[PDB]
């Protein structure tokens, strides 16, 4: 017998000791080697409750990533609370690596393997493991990149669909690739390419899933209504450079019911001055490096917020929202929980 419990986890990874790459260096000092023969015990006739929206593992992953970014992605100038801090900003090698989160002795991680599991409630197929799967710490807004895919059908996850303030995580079941590039020889101008045939098909599917939860109402996509560039644009980090991309074209109502079947190209820009996602002030990094910078990633999830209102209409409007970068972690950790044995 066991009970739900919190404790400090540790990490394991396949970090390379010979790498100068920044995720590798960090993990070399903060994590241990992985287990080549991981143990997983499936529990027959065991039912456990999970709540992805109340999981301290999510909180724990954030602290690690903050520490990692604080040691590595140091800026040329750092502006926080009215003061100016300068401390060199060398270019780094940056490419997220998978990190496993593990329980110490006297604890274990229960893992929900129930397909189409929405993240809250009972799970019928439960197994026990010492460590999670390898989770890449991809920091992004609007679109979840390089994450894990839904195992069956697309899953809509929310702490409370009725509550417009709770962020909706759409967990996709098929990887639509996004190809972003800043071509060699305005050095800060960039763009992302997405297969319009694949994407519009999937977006159409998301509408159908949303219809099941919202009584078959008309689903409308709209651009973000306001805020900092990190939220109104799709922001992420590519090869050390901070990309900001206009996703207006991705959430095109027209293609959800001709003309668009081609390649979709979003305008992007690399910024040197960024509002740090850790929530403080501004940070200035060096100008983008030279040559062709390219990262191809899978969109594996979408973060949405639904519009609030006291109207009596038949439509619901959705915008690529988000909130805490922690939500990104929730989408991957939703199937895990820590318990203390006896």
């Amino acid at each position, epitope marked *: 017998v066991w009970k739900d419990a919190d404790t400090t986890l540790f990490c394991a990874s396949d970090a390379k000791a010979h790498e100068t790459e920044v995720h590798n260096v960090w993990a070399t000092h903060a994590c241990v080697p992985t287990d080549p023969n991981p143990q997983e015990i499936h529990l027959e006739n065991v039912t456990e409750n999970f709540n992805m929206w109340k999981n301290n593992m999510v909180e724990q992953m954030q602290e690690d990533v903050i520490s990692l970014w604080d040691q590595s992605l140091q800026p040329c100038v750092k502006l926080t*609370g*009215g003061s100016v801090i300068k401390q060199a900003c060398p270019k780094i090698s940056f490419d997220p690596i998978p990190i496993h989160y593990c329980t110490p002795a006297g604890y274990v991680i229960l893992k929900c393997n129930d397909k189409n599991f929405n993240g809250t409630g009972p799970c019928k197929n439960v197994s026990s493991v010492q460590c999670t799967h390898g989770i890449k710490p991809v920091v992004s807004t609007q679109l979840l990149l390089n994450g894990s895919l839904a195992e069956e059908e697309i899953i809509i996850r929310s702490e*409370n669909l*009725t*509550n*417009n*303030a*709770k962020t909706i995580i759409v967990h996709l079941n098929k990887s639509v690739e996004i190809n972003c590039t800043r071509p060699s020889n305005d050095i800060r101008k960039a763009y992302c390419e997405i297969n319009g045939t694949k994407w519009n098909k999937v977006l159409k599917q998301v509408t159908e899933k949303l219809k099941e939860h919202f009584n078959n109402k008309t689903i409308i996509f709209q651009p*973000p*209504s*306001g*805020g*900092d560039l*990190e*939220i*109104t644009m799709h922001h992420f980090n590519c090869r050390g450079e901070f990309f900001y991309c206009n996703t207006t074209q991705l959430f095109n109502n027209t293609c959800i019911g001709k003309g668009c079947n081609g390649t979709i190209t979003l305008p992007c820009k690399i910024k040197q001055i960024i509002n740090m996602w850790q*929530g403080t002030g501004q940070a200035m990094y060096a100008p983008p490096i030279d040559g062709k910078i390219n990262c191809v990633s899978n969109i594996t999830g979408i973060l949405l*917020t639904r*519009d*609030g*209102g*006291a*109207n009596n*209409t038949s439509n619901e*409007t959705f915008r690529p*929202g*988000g*909130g*805490n970068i*922690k939500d990104n972690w929730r989408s991957e950790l939703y199937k895990y929980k820590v318990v203390q044995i006896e």
Partner: antibody
Amino acid sequence: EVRLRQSGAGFKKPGASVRVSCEASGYTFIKYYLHWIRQVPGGHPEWIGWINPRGGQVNYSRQFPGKFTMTRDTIRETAYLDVRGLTSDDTAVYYCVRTADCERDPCKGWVFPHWGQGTLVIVSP
Amino acid sequence: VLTQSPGTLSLSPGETAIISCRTSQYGSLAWYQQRPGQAPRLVIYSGSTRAAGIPDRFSGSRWGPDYTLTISNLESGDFGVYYCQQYEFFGQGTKVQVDI
């Protein structure tokens, strides 16, 4: 003690624009979403929207299409609202509200013990 | 979405006022008191939980898709108008006004 001080009242003409401000204090500013409530004299409190001091993302009410904007200043700890397309139906009192709680990184709540005094906006020819 | 009734109550200082409010969803519900010209003030929330400074003469209660605020021995400041709230929506209200 949580304190929300809104700007003074004012008079406007059909088609003008107002910026009602709300200076917050007594709490950690970022940890709490802020909401905006209007109230036409003789009407149920109509919800305008909320804003997140963290990012700045805003959730406008659908019943008021393109008649508002919300911004914030994380340093001076103050929220703003711009009433545009001023009409007869925009004559109301506007409130700046913060939720109870929290002990959480973001506070969404929807439970409102802390109100501003409100702002009188009278729009007439 | 939210049906609040009645619209008005004409009661005397000392009597008991009862204000009801219907709901379509089953989320938590709160009560606010608004004295004339003043800002609203929290009284009840989460169904029946009492707010700070609020005396036990007030009492929230839930039944089916219905919530009820009951006030005993009306005390001058108890007069005004009360609103039921669920999430972003608000009830039409009920003006508790003094009637001798």
